[PDB]
Design a protein around this ligand. Structure first.
Ligand SMILES: NC(=O)c1[nH]c2ccc(Br)cc2c1S(=O)(=O)N1CCCC1
Lengths: 554, 405
């Protein structure tokens, strides 16, 4: 049965004609297998014979566990076909679904082959069964329905199924139907008897539209394995995750493990991947063995422990608020959970992202909130109420003084260490009784060598030589010198906007080990005031460290 | 009625811009709005064979409880710039910025009485998404001039002129400028008299279907770079002063620092009070004078885009500069304030855009001191305007903020 549904008009891309690819000669057994397949398809309205008048062509092949299959290579027609609207804009997350009393899945029989193809387009679907040893013509057909492997099939199928379902939906708004490829998931809160009854009424409304579906006795029982998930009407989990037992790990084994651990992270809280991931850095062939670092071994063990014993999530109650909680798991690692009723998770997740080169826990926490806020809008249409391991004073102090704008949705502090905090502060004013260090760095672009140094108001001076640097590196090297030689309380004056910008943002972690050394020093001080002056002016101490540091390096 | 043919920019396709995720209440407001437009024939449902897309949102719109649908035609506007700008461009009047009073009126309803060329409709496609992607998006395209598309005012131009004709004849000294979905009405009348003429204008629009915001461009003055005035100057204070002066120059010609720097010779402590040799005081003396005046040499170039930079100053304050060439400031200003950073930045942007429309007839491309994603999720929460400017996301330079405080 081909559906009586109206047809979707189709077009070739602008300034293009249909495909005209010649048919390769086939073996006799293949021609034969194809003649049988087509006569059957023709005797069902799926395809139709045409002549040598239509000028387009698409290759056909035949392949074989011992039954023949027809293969049409639509590559060329696909390149000439217009673009369509995307089939799915995203897939639902199970955490966002509502709990259901009864749920069934109907798989649509011969999906594509039940929807008609635009009359004016059929012509470009022309294929030829060749004659024996090519001597002679060939049998020529064209499609009447949506072809397997054709660009427009998926979208046209789904649109047709959407048009066909509307009538039913209106008369049964208390019923959910989700369209996925050629399956239909049907959910209701009805008693088993009236659900079975509404299915049948559905199965028959579809039948009237040229679409077949399995009957009771033939339709599967929950749990439904779908998209890597296992769905029960009252709960959800990810499909069974087996972490292999291996004596030797190859890159391909670590990549697969990492992907399974990332997948499990949606519901198993605390899953970690950073040490395992560090191992995939650099990398050789997919086949090369990688010794597991210690760290990697502890992470695996910790993950293994989290994974023994199933964990399931609950579904969404739209009448209740969503609560999201976040914990710092370590350096750059964040983990979160979302619930509506304390401790019954709808879902879990982790966030790691390094945003920039130098950063702090205040900025990372706030980026994690943003990532969760976005995900929430997607899954539930609303933002959650957050519980953060950061004191309210800490947050407002930071957001208030920083130069970038921000806004978090409603949140409350929660005492779950480690608590988020700033590790040092720069003074707003120069320290009285503090030695002033005027710093500077210089680097030669040709030789790549440079010098970093300082001159203080209290007599001191120093210049150090560096060999494979950059100006930026010298300027940071200069600041570090001043922090090493100064003792608590110091005033540092630099001409580097670059180094200033970095330090003013109160970094606690960096990609640069030099930056990390500066940070470790900054946390040790009592008071640090840092200021900037334009280079190449007469500015006191500056003009002096500049000449000192320029010597031989410009 | 007949339709004006519309073409894209040669070898240029339609927009295929992703629909951002919307909250439950904005999705429901849109479903409601769109169901009513469709019933009235303004838009129709479309098939999978339309691969185009333009984003859509819902806004409240100044002191109104009602939801307004807002279509983001930024991309389509880019793909149709020869049509609305060269083919059917709307002249911008230079006298507008001079009027004492400018009133902004929303005239977008005018558009739905005009039909859109059948062969262009497909490019106006947009989608209403569902939560969790549990159902397919509701797909539509327009049958009439859409709001937010710069082709609509260009096409409706002739009818607008017929409509405003008697009022303009009767009031030779009032300037009326259309920009996108709004009308800008300026006069030099006393305020009650200005408001009276505005109500009269509303009566004329009302005879043709159509059915405000109050500026004072003439009162749009300065916003210099200010220098500190003080007794007892520190080494630290002097450095900060030359730093700011040094930066002031590059934009301002004449700024001098030698004397200020001469004050700083040797390797001094920051907390060292240093008496200003009169030679110096005469320097920031003339600099202070330099800074109080305008640029000189900077003019608007109509063939160039306008850029706007904004700095978060703290405690409700924001600074901004509009220019085409960096350092060649056409305008500078400030904006001051339940208000978060996003809500305040959102109002500053709309405020800067409106002045820019009034002054030059075009919107600036904004460089926003905010994380993209934060802006993306929050902006429509406080957006009230019917247009949307172009924007980028930047990280404010450390000193730039202090130099504009
Ligand atoms: N729309 C829903 O809220 C919904 N809720 C469910 C709960 C459990 C099961 Br099993 C299926 C469901 C469904 S469903 O059947 O539509 N569909 C399952 C795949 C994604 C949505």
């Amino acid at each position: 049965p081909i559906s009586p549904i109206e047809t979707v008009p189709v077009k070739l891309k602008p300034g293009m004609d249909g495909p005209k690819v010649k048919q390769w000669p086939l073996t006799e057994e293949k021609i034969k297998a194809l003649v049988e397949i087509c006569t059957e398809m023709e005797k069902e309205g799926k395809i139709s014979k045409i002549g040598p008048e239509n000028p387009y062509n698409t290759p056909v092949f035949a392949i074989k566990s011992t039954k023949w299959r027809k293969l049409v290579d639509f590559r060329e027609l696909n390149k000439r076909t217009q673009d369509f609207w995307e089939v799915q804009l995203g897939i639902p997350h199970p955490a966002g679904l509502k709990k259901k009393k009864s749920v069934t899945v109907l798989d649509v029989g011969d999906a594509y082959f039940s929807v008609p193809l635009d009359e004016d387009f059929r012509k470009y679907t022309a294929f030829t069964i060749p004659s024996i040893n090519n001597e002679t013509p060939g049998i020529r057909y064209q499609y009447n329905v949506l072809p397997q492997g054709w660009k427009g099939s998926p979208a046209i199928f789904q649109s047709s199924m959407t048009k066909i379902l509307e009538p039913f939906r209106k008369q049964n708004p208390d019923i959910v139907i989700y369209q996925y490829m050629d399956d239909l998931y049907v959910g209701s809160d009805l008693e088993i008897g009236q659900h079975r009854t509404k299915i049948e009424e559905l199965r028959q409304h579809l039948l009237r539209w040229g679409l077949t579906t399995p009957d009771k006795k033939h339709q599967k029982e929950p749990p439904f394995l779908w998209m890597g998930y296992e769905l029960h009407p009252d709960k959800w989990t990810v499909q069974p995750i087996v972490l292999p037992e291996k004596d030797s790990w190859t890159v391909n084994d670590i990549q697969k493990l990492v992907g399974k651990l990332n997948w499990a992270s949606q519901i198993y809280p605390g899953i970690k991947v950073r040490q395992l991931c560090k191992l995939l850095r650099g990398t050789k062939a997919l086949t090369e063995v990688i010794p597991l670092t210690e760290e990697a071994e502890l992470e695996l063990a910790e993950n293994r422990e989290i994974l023994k014993e199933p964990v399931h999530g609950v579904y969404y109650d739209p009448s209740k608020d969503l609560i999201a909680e976040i914990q710092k798991q370590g350096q750059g690692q964040w983990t979160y959970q979302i619930y509506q009723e304390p401790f019954k998770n709808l879902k879990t997740g982790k966030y790691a992202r390094m945003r920039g080169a130098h950063t702090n826990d205040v900025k990372q926490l706030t980026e994690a909130v943003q990532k969760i806020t976005t995900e929430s809008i997607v899954i539930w249409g609303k933002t959650p109420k957050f519980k953060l391991p950061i004191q309210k004073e800490t947050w407002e102090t930071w957001w208030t003084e920083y130069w970038q704008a921000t806004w978090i949705p409603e949140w409350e502090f929660v005492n779950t260490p480690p608590l988020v905090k700033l590790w040092y502060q720069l003074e707003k004013e120069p320290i009285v009784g503090a030695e002033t260090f005027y710093v500077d760095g210089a680097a030669n672009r040709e030789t790549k060598l440079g010098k970093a140094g300082y001159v203080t108001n209290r007599g001191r001076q120093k210049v150090v030589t560096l060999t494979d640097t950059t100006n930026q590196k010298t300027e940071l090297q200069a600041i570090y010198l001043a922090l090493q030689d100064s003792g608590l309380e110091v005033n540092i004056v630099t001409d580097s906007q670059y180094a200033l910008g970095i330090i003013q943002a109160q970094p606690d972690q960096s990609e640069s080990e030099l930056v990390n050394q500066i940070i470790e020093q900054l946390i040790k001080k009592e008071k640090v005031y840092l200021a900037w002056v334009p280079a190449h002016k007469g500015i006191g101490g500056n003009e002096q460290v500049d000449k000192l540091v320029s010597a031989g390096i410009r | 009625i007949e339709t004006v043919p519309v073409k894209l920019k040669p070898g240029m396709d339609g927009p295929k811009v992703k629909q951002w995720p919307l909250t439950e209440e904005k999705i429901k407001a849109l479903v409601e709005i769109c169901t009513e437009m469709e019933k009235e024939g303004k838009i129709s449902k479309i098939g999978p064979e339309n691969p185009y897309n333009t984003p859509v949102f819902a806004i409240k719109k100044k002191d109104s409880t009602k939801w307004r649908k807002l279509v983001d035609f930024r991309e389509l506007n880019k793909r149709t710039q020869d049509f609305w700008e060269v083919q059917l461009g709307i002249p911008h009047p230079a006298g507008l910025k001079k009027k004492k009073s400018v009133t902004v009126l929303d005239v977008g309803d005018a558009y739905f009485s005009v039909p859109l060329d059948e062969d262009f409709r497909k490019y106006t496609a947009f989608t209403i998404p569902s939560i969790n992607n549990e159902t397919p998006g509701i797909r539509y395209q327009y049958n009439v001039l859409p709001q937010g598309w710069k082709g609509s005012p260009a096409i409706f131009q002739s009818s607008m002129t017929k409509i405003l004709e008697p009022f303009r004849k009767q009031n030779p000294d009032i300037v009326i400028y259309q920009y996108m979905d709004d009308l800008y009405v300026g006069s030099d009348l006393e305020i009650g008299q200005h408001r009276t003429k505005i109500e009269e204008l509303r009566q004329h629009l009302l005879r043709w279907g159509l059915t405000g915001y109050e500026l004072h461009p003439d009162k749009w003055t300065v916003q210099p770079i200010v220098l500190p005035e003080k007794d007892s100057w520190t080494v630290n204070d002097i450095q900060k002063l030359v730093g700011k002066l040094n930066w002031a120059s590059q934009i301002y010609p004449g700024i001098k620092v030698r004397q200020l720097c001469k004050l700083l010779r040797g390797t001094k402590a920051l907390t060292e009070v240093i008496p200003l040799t009169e030679e110096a005081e005469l320097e920031l003396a003339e600099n202070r004078e330099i800074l109080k005046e305008p640029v000189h040499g900077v003019y608007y170039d109509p063939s160039k885009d306008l850029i706007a930079e904004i700095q978060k100053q703290g405690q409700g304050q924001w600074t901004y500069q509009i220019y085409q060439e960096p350092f060649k400031n056409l305008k500078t200003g400030k904006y001051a304030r339940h208000t978060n950073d996003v809500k305040q930045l959102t109002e500053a942007v709309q405020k800067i855009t409106t002045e820019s429309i009034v002054i030059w007839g075009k919107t600036p491309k904004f460089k926003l001191p905010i994380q993209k994603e934060t802006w993306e999720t929050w902006w429509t929460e406080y957006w009230q305007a019917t247009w949307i400017p172009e924007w980028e996301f930047v990280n404010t330079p450390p000193l730039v903020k202090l130099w504009y405080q």
